[PDB]
Structures are given as structure tokens and as C-alpha cells.
Subunit: 90 residues, 6 copies
């Protein structure tokens, strides 16, 4: 039940750049890569809280240079019930 980091962008170029900067900046695993329409894509990572916080800061900053960031967030310990609604693979 590790920390969860999320970066949502409008556009796929921003999502790919966020994903690359997140995995490169800290020891985190890509666990979600979700499209919900209206061009919105959410990149999700998991790891220890410090690594996830560093990853989301790097990802949002990198995606904002090339594209459009909608939201970014860290959940240090998602409730066990939340795992049902999280993606099962990136």
C-alpha cells in the first residue's frame, strides 16, 4: 500500500514527457496510463512517499514545458478500498 503519484495532462506529448521525467527522477514504478476523453491522460506512479513526491514534482514541471498540465497530486497511503478503482497495469 505504497504512495501514489498522479500527473494529468491535456495531450499525449505532455503525458509521455511526464512519465519519462517521473521514472527518471526517482525510484518509482509506472502503474497507470489512463485516457478519459477530452484529451485528458493521467500518468500514475507508485513508490515510497519521498520518491513519489520527487517524481510528481519532476513530471508536472516537465509536462508543463511541452504541454498542458491539468492536475497533479500525491496520496501517501491510498485507502485499501481505493485499490479497486486504480488501474491494474500502466
Amino acid at each position: 500500500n505504497n504512495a501514489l503519484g498522479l500527473v494529468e495532462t491535456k495531450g499525449l506529448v505532455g503525458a509521455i514527457e511526464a512519465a519519462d521525467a517521473m521514472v527518471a527522477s526517482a525510484n518509482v514504478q509506472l502503474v497507470g496510463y489512463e485516457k478519459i476523453g477530452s484529451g485528458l491522460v493521467t500518468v500514475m506512479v507508485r513508490g515510497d512517499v519521498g520518491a513519489v513526491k520527487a517524481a510528481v514534482d519532476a513530471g508536472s514541471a516537465a509536462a508543463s514545458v511541452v504541454g498542458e498540465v491539468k492536475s497533479c497530486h500525491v496520496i501517501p497511503r491510498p485507502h485499501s478500498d481505493v485499490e479497486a478503482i486504480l488501474p491494474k497495469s500502466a
Copy 2:
């Protein structure tokens, strides 16, 4: 035929944060997690009315900090006919 709580967000980060805050704030079960396009996602919970009201208040407040809330509502006792149109799992 328990109470139904709904939080609809524009963006997946807001939906995940609403879902986490709803299940953490009261004894409710996640029963819906629906995408309808235009980036709209609806998170649905069920439980006793007091727990559902507390969950929707927590979820809408949490989602509004990180994303965009479209609507939130509680139906204390959905009509039996309505169960046909509700999701069958989250």
C-alpha cells in the same frame, strides 16, 4: 436499498482523490466509477445516509482542492427502478 452518494469531476485526479477521501471519511462502499466523456468521471458510494452524506462532503471538498468538481449529490433511497441504470461494480 441504501443511500447513494455521487461525486462527478472533470479529470481523473479529482475522481481518485474524491474516491479516497469518501472511503476514508465514512463507512461507505465504492459502487461506481464511470466515464461519460468530456473528461467527466463519476464516483459512487453506498451506505447508511449519514455515512454517505459525510462521504460526499469529504469527497467533493478533497476533489475541489486538486481538480474540478462538476456535481455532487446524495439520494437517501433510490427508487427500485433506478437500480437498473446504476453501475453493477466500481
Copy 3:
């Protein structure tokens, strides 16, 4: 070939609230619950014209309190050819 009532909302919370208020306010059956993108959802009911008119008035009013109503309408007797394009279940 009974009367048809339609409530179209932008957002799922408005659609669920319309559906609940429609079935609770009159003796009508839920026959359609359709998503067409751009967050638009249409709730459809059937029954005798008086019941359908009461249902659509209740549904549009209820959905407007919690969400956004796009259109609402009653067709007292849809032409037989129209049944081809109507949903086959809610």
C-alpha cells in the same frame, strides 16, 4: 406505442437524479439511458402521456438543481418507424 419522455443532461449526476425523480413521480418505465459523448446522457421513459409529462417535468426540475439539463421533451405517440432508433433497454 406509448408516450416517450426524454431528459438529456450534461453530466451523469444530473442523469441519475433525473431518472430517480422520473420513476418516483409517475407510473413510467425506464427504457433508455444513453451516452453520446461531450458528457451528454439521455434518460428515457415510457408510459401513458399524463404520466410521461409528469415524469419529464419532475426529472428536468430535479436534474437542474444538481447538474445541467440540455433538453427535455415528450413525444405522445412516436411513429412506428422511430422505434428502430430507440434503445432496446435502459
Copy 4:
């Protein structure tokens, strides 16, 4: 290779009302009912040119009262090559 009539609406309520008014106003057959996203729905009819012109005039007028009409048009004789891109059923 009969005449083709088209009414495109933003919203399903407008599309259903166009379809009902088209089939009721003239001897035309419903041959298309297509969703392309952004809430756009196109209703298509076929028949003799006079019937199709009457149907499209009735459909666009009826849909404009309850919803939003995007476009309406009549093609008196679609080119044989065009039949490939037309729907195969309503």
C-alpha cells in the same frame, strides 16, 4: 439510388425529435442514425426527392424547437461511390 436527407444535431433529444418528425411528415425510410462524438448525432432518411426535402424541412424545424441543429441537407442522387461511406442500417 434514391435521395438522401440528413439532419445533424448536438444532443440525442434533438435527433429523436428530428427522426420522428421526418418519418411522420413524408414517405421516407430511416437509413442512418450515427454518433461521431462532441454530442453530434446524424439522422438519415431516403426516399423520393420531394418526400426527402419535406422530411428534412420538418426534421430540422422540429429538432430546433427542442434541441440544437448543426446542419441539414438533401442530396437528390448520391454518387454510387458514396454508398460505401453511408451507414448500412439506422
Copy 5:
């Protein structure tokens, strides 16, 4: 590796009218009819460059009268690598 002509419209009525005017105005074959969301539809034709240029001019003009044209273009000789991303049928 013949010339490629493209007409992209917002709305299906504009796409059908473009397709009909393109095939009627010159000796071209319909090779693509693609939906990408946000109501965008791209009609594609192939043939000799003069026929394709005449087709795209006719199609964009016809679609602009009834609907909304987003873009139109002619590629006289698409690179062999591009054939991978072109539709395999209209």
C-alpha cells in the same frame, strides 16, 4: 503510390457532402472515412494529382456550404512509410 486528397470536417453532414462532391468532380477513389472525436471526420481520396486537386477543391467548397471544414490538403506522392498510418478502407 498515387496522390492523396483529404477533407476534414466538424460534423458528419459536411463529410458526406465533401465525399459526394469529391467523387462526382473527378476520377478519384474513396480510401478513408475516419472519425477522431470532437466531431472531426476526415474524408480521403486517391487518384492522379490533377483529379485529386480538383476533388479536394470541390469537396472543401461543398462541405463549407452545409457544414464546417477544419482542413483540406493534397499530398501528390505520400512517402512509402506513410502508407502504414493511412486507412486500409473507407
Copy 6:
């Protein structure tokens, strides 16, 4: 683990023109052609960094003449973890 070039357009005509100009301007392979809704399409190429940079410059310039460019970017060496979220074919 070669360089990755991305051109995202609003509209398919811009995407096809970007893809053609990218493959024609440098020795790059088309590796992605992705639709995410809201009319957004991302064209992806791979190759040596100099070829990818030349391809993305040519593609964005060409797509901007005929359509709308949302973003363009080059990643000289995507992190190994990123390959999970990249398309598996164009």
C-alpha cells in the same frame, strides 16, 4: 533505446501531413499514431537524435501550415521504464 520524436495535432489532416514530412525529412521510423479524443492525434518517430530532431522540426512546420499543432518534442533517450507506455506499432 533510440531517440523519440512526437508531434501532436488537433485534426487528422495535420497528423498525416506531419507523418509524411517527418519520414521524408530524415531517416526515422513511424512508431506511434495515437488518438486520445478531443480531436488530438500524436505521431511518433524513432531514430538517431539528429534525424529525430530534423523530423520533428519538419513535421511540426508542415502540420502547422495545414492544421493545428498542439505540442512537439524530442526525447533523446527515453528511460527504459517509459517503453511500457509507448505504442507497440504505428
